[PDB]
Amino acid sequence: KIPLRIQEDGGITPNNDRAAWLLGLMKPADPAKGITDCYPLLGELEEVFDFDKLSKTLHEKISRCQGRPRSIAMAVDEALKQYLRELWEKSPSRQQDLKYYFQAVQEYFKDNFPIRTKRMGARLRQELLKDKTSLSRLLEPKHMANAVRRRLINQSTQMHILYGKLYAYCCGEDGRLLVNSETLQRIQVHEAVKKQAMTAVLWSISRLRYFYQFEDGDILSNKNPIKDFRDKFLRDTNKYTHEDVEACKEKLQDFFPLKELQEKIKEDAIGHIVRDDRKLCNQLLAECVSCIGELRHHIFHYKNVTLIQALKRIADKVKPEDLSVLRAIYLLDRRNLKKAFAKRISSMNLPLYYREDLLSRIFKKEGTAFFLYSAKIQMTPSFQRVYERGKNLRREFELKWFRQDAQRALRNLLLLIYRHHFLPEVQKDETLVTGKIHKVLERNRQLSEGQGPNQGKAHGYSVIEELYHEGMPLSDLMKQLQRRISETERESRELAQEKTDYAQRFILDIFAEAFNDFLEAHYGEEYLEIMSPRKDAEAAKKWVKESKTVDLKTSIDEKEPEGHLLVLYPVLRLLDERELGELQQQMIRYRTSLASWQGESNFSEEIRIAGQIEELTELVKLTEPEPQFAEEVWGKRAKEAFEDFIEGNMKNYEAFYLQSDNNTPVYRRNMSRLLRSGLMGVYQKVLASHKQALKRDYLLWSEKHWNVKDENGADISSAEQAQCLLQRLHRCKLYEKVLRRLEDYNQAVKNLSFSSLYEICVLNLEILSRWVGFVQDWERDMYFLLLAWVRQGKLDGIKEEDVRDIFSEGNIIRNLVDTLKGENMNAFESVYFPENKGSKYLGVRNDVAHLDLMRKNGWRLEAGKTCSVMEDYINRLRFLLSYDQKRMNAVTKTLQQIFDRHKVKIRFTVEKGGMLKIEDVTADKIVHLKGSRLSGIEIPSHGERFIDTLKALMVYPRG
């Protein structure tokens, strides 16, 4: 049962004694009164509960355990139960509160002194029990009393948040969602999509700050100072010279297609605006502000329970009539779906490995069924996972497919058919996927019988066979498979991974079989040409000239863009590829969850609109502008962004930057991506004393001439021979230097080509995006916390309306301080951690939400501070998220996961007062020839320069 029940008169009543007890725990007291504790009942209980005698008795019991962690744990638990029992017996008047208090202390002692060590944390705690200092600290009467209080306080806060969400959704005006068991899941799904949508909005505002060259101010506000600045921006010739105009147009080009728009109008109402460079930039920026500004103050607030309803409301206010420039760009990019696929084909070396006749055989065949984006539902595997599983399934067999730059082109070719042609047909008919289920199931049963009886436990598809009969559609079984994943994950973290693996393992098998069969029925004879990759220089050149003939099929109307979809376009076009993917997956999860529901609203639009948004996301990704340069552009932003990272002068290193064009011409693809991210301003100040392009790396690349010889004594003079030599041994110390030389060669080429710097730039944006997500979780939690406090008369002088003004006006930190005064401010501050006080960690939300780390000014400290900038944010963020646990300690857990993804390791040390300091960032150790014969060769996954320059970013100011 849900611990709260929604009444007919608008109130909410606890559904259990524990719920009411946790609801009534908090009772604010003003500093004028003697009471300074917001939880006086806890004070009375800790006065009753003598922890000194507990500590003394437990120490005496442990003294006879001879230091054995298991014996110590048993002694503590028996003495615990004894002491709890006489405390219960001699205290009859307060038994109800004591019940929950012994529940809390038992939970604490079970967490710290685990009886059962089937989990890693329990084993680590038992190992820590060996240290005398650790046992002495854990036995402290006080420390052990404060932690018991904190566990009770955290439960009270979390139960109060549940009150806020139920009132905000199911009791606001007319009960938008009927109260039921499924209510909690529906609210979580609605909140998840909104926060991600809000997260994408904050990333777009950074670009507006970048374009206007304006900071420390709300660019989206309509007050007289800021509004006047934007209206006359880039208009006055006296203040904004033509060179200033050129710089702004260059930044906008990386995101919006401007040269294409100007060319189209010249070939052919709004021509006067576009023909002038000054007016085109001014008008386009203003329309983005109007769409983003109203989008910011619509996702939250209460007239729109769903994100879709918030989009319709903005569409009515912001019509396409004043969005004329946005409409023109939308129509151009939708119409330019011919070139978009043409450059996509060339980008993956497709025409430089295959002839035109075979390429036209697949794509252009009496009208193609290549759709831009299928309505593929959640859990459908991506191409990469199925391809890796396909070869592994072939590995044991070594079907007719999944056979083995040559392999890169084959993977790229098979990706295009999978995601553009195979999936839409799977959506139409499900017999391709559902019909192949039995073949996978029968194969695994034979595998199980091939093992010993002692190893045949936990058959992989045992549960799947129970769920599966003959007749359900793919989606229905897909819902069934997802149903088992969600239900089991709530039971145990250990079994969640072991049972999410068996579900996904079957998922990879079933899709591979259908993909193989589908290819036979459609191509048949072009098979042997597919895996016959032939290099051809002249083939690529003709495809570049003769292009823009391949066609795609979309459901988007070609004449009238819809009102709601047009609002999203400035937000989507101002995001990077990493952010676009994250938002797209949320709509897939949102739409899929909606389908399983049977709510009494008939929907019929949320499902339809969500599919439209996903298709629009794919269109934006394909039509990404690709301006090479305009001759002078090289002697511009591109030049004044990397000269400080290169030793000597650009006159040197001429051989490396003037190689064959291929896919990396005189302009580096990485060098263009670094500028687009907008972080080069930060790196010119932080990583200034780290030369990315050195002479030592250049000398090693050009003058190759290794002393190494082959197995026959012949010298190696090219990396191609060594790679063949390295792979030849793959299929003693002589090959020690062979792979070491290649690894040292790779580090030089990665440093010179700026591929090492781009790795950090992707790494840096992953850290920032996670911190923005933490802020969104905190902001929505405080909204529901204050909402419940206003109800049932817990806050004073704060009416219902004032809370909505704090979180829906701007500068939440400022309004929260002003509105909450005296008792309320003290009551609100009783949930966080005073670990190192500071009394200013609430101000880190502005630093994260506004993305101050993406600017030169944001990378600065104060006189008092000593820890580095990255170390500074972590401490405040941990304090900010200290209102509840898990999230507080997830700041460093996700940071380690992100570094793990890049094959790097980071370590943190606990200082005095709980402050965390970065000790070192060490590279991983990838092993080749593992286990086989000699001990596995250990080599770092990254070079010396990459680790050193990554270290400086993490500790910019100092240690």
XYZ file of N, CA and C in Angstrom, residues 357 359-369 526 551:
42
model
N 27.717 0.875 -59.421
C 26.655 -0.046 -59.814
C 26.143 -0.841 -58.619
N 26.486 0.085 -55.365
C 25.853 1.031 -54.450
C 24.457 1.407 -54.928
N 24.303 1.662 -56.229
C 22.976 1.927 -56.775
C 22.090 0.689 -56.711
N 22.692 -0.502 -56.705
C 21.910 -1.730 -56.604
C 21.167 -1.800 -55.276
N 21.776 -1.285 -54.209
C 21.148 -1.323 -52.891
C 20.200 -0.145 -52.708
N 20.697 1.071 -52.944
C 19.940 2.269 -52.595
C 18.848 2.569 -53.618
N 19.235 2.817 -54.868
C 18.301 3.268 -55.901
C 17.820 2.064 -56.699
N 16.681 1.499 -56.289
C 16.103 0.334 -56.968
C 14.594 0.540 -57.094
N 14.182 1.168 -58.199
C 12.768 1.351 -58.541
C 11.989 1.986 -57.390
N 12.632 2.916 -56.689
C 12.036 3.493 -55.503
C 12.389 2.681 -54.275
N 13.010 3.317 -53.287
C 13.507 2.626 -52.109
C 12.563 2.820 -50.930
N 12.636 1.885 -49.981
C 11.887 1.963 -48.732
C 12.731 2.492 -47.579
N 24.072 -10.235 -54.723
C 25.088 -9.232 -54.418
C 25.877 -9.556 -53.156
N 17.401 9.253 -52.181
C 16.199 9.798 -51.569
C 15.834 9.039 -50.299
